Design a protein around this nucleic acid. Structure first.
Ligand SMILES: [Mg+2]
Ligand SMILES: [Mg+2]
Ligand SMILES: [Mg+2]
Ligand SMILES: [Mg+2]
Ligand SMILES: [Mg+2]
Ligand SMILES: [Mg+2]
Ligand SMILES: [Mg+2]
Ligand SMILES: [Mg+2]
Ligand SMILES: [Mg+2]
Ligand SMILES: [Mg+2]
Ligand SMILES: [Mg+2]
Ligand SMILES: [Mg+2]
Ligand SMILES: [Mg+2]
Ligand SMILES: [Mg+2]
Ligand SMILES: [Mg+2]
Ligand SMILES: [Mg+2]
Ligand SMILES: [Mg+2]
Ligand SMILES: [Mg+2]
Ligand SMILES: [Mg+2]
Lengths: 117, 60, 206
RNA sequence: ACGCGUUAAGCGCGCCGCCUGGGGAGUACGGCCGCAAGGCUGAAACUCAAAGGAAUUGACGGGGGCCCGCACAAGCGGUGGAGCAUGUGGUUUAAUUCGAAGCAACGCGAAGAACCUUACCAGGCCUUGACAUGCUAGGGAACCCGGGUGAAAGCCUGGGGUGCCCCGCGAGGGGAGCCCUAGCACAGGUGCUGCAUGGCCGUCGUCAGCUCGUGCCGUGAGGUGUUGGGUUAAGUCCCGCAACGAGCGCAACCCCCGCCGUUAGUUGCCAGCGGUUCGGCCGGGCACUCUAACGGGACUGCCCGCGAAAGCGGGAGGAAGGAGGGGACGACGUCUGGUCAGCAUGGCCCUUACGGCCUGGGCGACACACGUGCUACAAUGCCCACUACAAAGCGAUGCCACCCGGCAACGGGGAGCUAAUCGCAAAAAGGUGGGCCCAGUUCGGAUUGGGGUCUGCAACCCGACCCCAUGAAGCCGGAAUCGCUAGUAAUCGCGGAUCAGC
């Protein structure tokens, strides 16, 4: 913008640091602009506040869950392993296969190996 | 008394030293700034409104 | 009992005077007394029109008197029948040649002293003291303001114990000099004593 | 509800004991038991509209933890003592007008009480009224000049006077202005109620707070956010967190002061050079100084250390760091705070008087008590003389240079200045010399006698100033107690507002 040059002194931090946090939490959340139709949760005990809200609103709850958690309040459960980067990976990815594969034209098994080890 | 008196103070009197000021609004004897004919009260009032030209909050 | 007048707080900036005439230290006194009995007469016989500011200028035996109103029609009369009567009434006290512009306040819900008057008017016609406030603010926010706030004093609804109703919306930052906050005050002489109406409208900035 | 929760206060079955508002009362009576102390069983009359339980928000604690502020400590100067000025309490008065009451009343409203002011008293007076708008009615209708009387107000008076509507009349009557008297609607009241009020103010407090929206938690009041960890002057920022945001606040946006630049030359100057009766005064020059407008400059931007971050300690550069220094600026609310006597205003009260006008006195009383102040009590001082330190404001019913008269206040004259130009204006402390020599003093300047000057109609009650005389208490102040953290305190003079003078 033209105002990357102007704005009072104490506002190219005040405003630009506000954008930092908004960037930090609302990176992926910036996309949906009506409630979703489902939620995929990794550890529903860790992520209990989220599940709560879903159910409250009758949004179904998919989850990779394990011995940690109460299954009864997961609608679609994948009994696995909320901890292993392997497990989260195997499942999270193949589920995103189906997601594109319901729309055609799948891609590779994904950039999904951090410095995996 | 403050009617018969707003009147009396305008009458030119025997002897000029019987004469005196009065807030031409708020009809009043004491603290009456002669540069305005205005009682300190009925004055702070105008001064605030903008009805006294060039007069301003002093701050130094 | 705290708090300065928001106009007076701003006169040098974000608000200029209701009288822009120089004088030496021996005219000022009289060019004021006149200046005032002017507004004393104008405001009194001109309530119907609804006057905000009564601006005034001078330049030696001529006077500007740029009266701002919501209803120009009412000061003029169909053609020019009243505006004549007024120019005529003025020079009988003002021994000088009284000029006289007239202005429309394009939106009267953003003129604070009009909003005050409005609410004060309602109160004298025993209206719902608390909803008047509520509505008035709304109206003002509705005509696109940045904030507003209205205050009425006490004996609300002829009650025995004085009280104080207020309501407000958006921002009304009374401490910011660069705000532009039209303020306004109306009386309200009722059967059971005076109430006091204050009104604040935030609009401005840099 | 707190909580319980396989050691139920959960879900069920069996059997026992017990409760049925509080006080009277575990009392009275009776019975049983007991050595006794007493125990068990256990009422009523009368009487209350509650008595209770758990939890909520506060507030409080001679509970806890964290932290601030001239809060105490550390200091320097004060008050309480004396004289005097001033405000107040009390008393006194014909009256000593009213208000203000711990902080947050008491050099407060009063930024100017001799008459004015003035709201108080005593006396002489006016009543449709000193002021606004109208009505009913005979009288005159614009107006001018005296006299009597009185302290003045007012009152009793004798003259000068005929303009304008109208022509309707060629002989002038009709309340057109205007002015009178007699009635009427009304004015007037600083009379009362700040506990009927507006407004404006004070105040906790410039304290770091007070809230809202939606979401979430609780049956609920409410809670969460606003708790927690770090940090700040700050609910300031940071990190976390069923919250996410926001508003009134904080800060910033505004004024003054520190450094520099631009624009500008009746104030600045040998800065440069020239003339100078050697006064920036003269031509000349804005360089400088200043004046006043507009910009720049500071950001934790830069370097070292700590920290997750905010930020913290230190360093450089810079006139100026980490809020550079002083203002302006006062959240939701609190105090039934303050003011009806500035004004405005609901109600109640006075209307030949609770209104008005005047002269005079009073607000200035003085056996006393208190607050705030001044001047002191001396040699780091007092007195006299000489001697540029410079720095905000006022001044044409004014500031008054300069001459002269007077010891002087002041009085005569008299130039300049609507004022960066001329005046008030001497700054004082300081500096240089001289005096005093530790004394109730050459300290101190109360009180008092006398002579004056000025403002003002007028200075007895009641002014300030000058001059002679007179020189009081006072030798640093009991218990108590006040301010101030830096250009501050301490000290020294200077100006203004109000205002004839004070
Ligand atoms: Mg006077
Ligand atoms: Mg348990
Ligand atoms: Mg009972
Ligand atoms: Mg309890
Ligand atoms: Mg409690
Ligand atoms: Mg101490
Ligand atoms: Mg004393
Ligand atoms: Mg009173
Ligand atoms: Mg009150
Ligand atoms: Mg009030
Ligand atoms: Mg009172
Ligand atoms: Mg609920
Ligand atoms: Mg904040
Ligand atoms: Mg804090
Ligand atoms: Mg601020
Ligand atoms: Mg009270
Ligand atoms: Mg008198
Ligand atoms: Mg007095
Ligand atoms: Mg001695």
């Amino acid at each position: 913008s033209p105002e990357i040059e102007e704005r009072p002194k104490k506002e190219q931090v005040r405003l630009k640091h506000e954008l930092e946090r908004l960037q930090k939490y609302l990176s992926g959340f910036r996309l949906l602009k009506r409630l979703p139709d489902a939620i995929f949760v990794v550890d529903p005990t860790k992520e209990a506040i989220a599940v709560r809200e879903a159910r409250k609103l009758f949004i179904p709850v998919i989850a990779l869950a394990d011995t940690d958690s109460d299954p009864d309040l997961v609608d679609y459960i994948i009994p696995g392993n909320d901890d292993a980067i392997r497990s989260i990976q195997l499942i999270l990815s193949r589920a995103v296969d189906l997601i594109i594969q319901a729309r055609g034209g799948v891609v590779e098994p994904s950039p999904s190996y951090a410095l995996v080890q | 008394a403050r009617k018969a008196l707003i009147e009396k103070a305008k009458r030119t009197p025997k002897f000029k030293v019987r004469a005196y000021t009065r807030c031409v609004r708020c009809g009043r004897a004491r603290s009456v700034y002669r540069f305005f004919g205005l009682c300190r009260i009925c004055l702070r009032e105008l001064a605030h409104k903008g009805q006294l030209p060039g007069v301003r909050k002093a701050s130094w | 009992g705290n708090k300065i007048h928001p106009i007076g707080f701003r006169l040098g900036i974000t608000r200029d005077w209701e009288s822009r005439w120089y004088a030496g230290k021996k005219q000022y006194r009289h060019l004021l007394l006149e200046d005032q009995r002017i507004r004393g007469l104008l405001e009194k016989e001109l309530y119907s029109a609804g006057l905000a500011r009564v601006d005034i200028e001078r330049a030696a035996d001529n006077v500007a008197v740029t009266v701002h109103v919501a209803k120009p029609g009412v000061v003029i009369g169909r053609g020019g029948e009243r505006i004549r009567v007024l120019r005529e009434e003025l020079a009988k006290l003002t021994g000088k040649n009284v000029a006289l512009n007239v202005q429309e306040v394009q939106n009267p819900n953003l003129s604070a002293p009009l909003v005050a008057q409005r609410v004060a008017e309602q109160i004298e016609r025993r209206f719902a003291v608390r909803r008047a406030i509520k509505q008035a603010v709304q109206r003002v926010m509705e005509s696109g303001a940045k904030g507003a706030k209205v205050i009425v004093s006490g004996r609300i609804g002829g009650a025995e114990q004085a009280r104080t109703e207020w309501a407000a919306q958006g921002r009304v930052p009374l401490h910011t000099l660069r705000a532009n906050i039209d303020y306004g005050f109306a009386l309200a002489r009722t059967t059971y004593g005076v109430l006091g109406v204050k009104a604040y409208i935030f609009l401005g900035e840099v």
